[PDB]
């Protein structure tokens, strides 16, 4: 944290304020209690097998079909 | 399934011993019980004696 302040005091950037801190921690907690009634769903199984291969695992007779 | 392997049957949750041949219709396995009936175009000839012919041929 010492090391952090000097860094931050070093570099001129104006640490930040702690009404700040206290409205944007809020912003994890509501997002996590997100629910998910738009259409992501679609973007994130597209993402994830973007990168996950296919065969894995009990869709091989699907992939060859 | 046309011409699957038993590997892919298996894969499918399914097995190679359905004999299959049977419709999915609402979830539920329907299958046609074959109907019979009289041959067309033959000629066959009856004697009803309940009535006032004594031969009839059907076609």
Same mark, same amino acid.
């Not at chain 1, 302040?5 to 104006?14: H, I, L, P, V």
């Not at chain 1, 259409?39 to 199984?45: G, K």
């Not at chain 2, 038993?6 to 999915?24: A, K, W």
């Given at each position: 944290?010492?090391?952090?302040?000097?860094?931050?005091?070093?570099?001129?950037?104006?640490?930040?304020?702690?009404?700040?801190?206290?409205?944007?921690?809020?912003?994890?907690?509501?997002?996590?209690?997100?629910?998910?009634?738009?259409?992501?769903?679609?973007?994130?199984?597209?993402?994830?097998?973007?990168?996950? !291969?296919?065969?894995?695992?009990?869709?091989?007779?699907?992939?060859?079909? | 399934?046309?011409?699957?392997?038993?590997?892919?049957?298996?894969?499918?949750?399914?097995?190679?011993?359905?004999?299959?041949?049977?419709?999915?219709?609402?979830?539920?396995? !329907?299958?046609?019980?074959?109907?019979?009936?009289?041959?067309?175009?033959?000629?066959?000839?009856?004697? !009803?004696?309940?009535?006032?012919?004594?031969?009839?041929?059907?076609?």
């Amino acid at each position: 944290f010492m090391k952090w302040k000097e860094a931050m005091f070093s570099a001129g950037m104006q640490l930040p304020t702690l009404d700040e801190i206290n409205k944007k921690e809020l912003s994890i907690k509501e997002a996590l209690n997100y629910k998910f009634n738009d259409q992501d769903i679609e973007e994130i199984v597209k993402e994830k097998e973007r990168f996950r !291969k296919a065969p894995p695992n009990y869709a091989m007779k699907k992939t060859q079909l | 399934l046309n011409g699957l392997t038993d590997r892919d049957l298996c894969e499918l949750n399914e097995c190679p011993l359905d004999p299959g041949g049977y419709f999915i219709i609402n979830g539920s396995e !329907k299958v046609l019980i074959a109907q019979e009936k009289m041959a067309t175009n033959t000629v066959y000839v009856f004697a !009803k004696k309940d009535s006032k012919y004594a031969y009839t041929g059907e076609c």
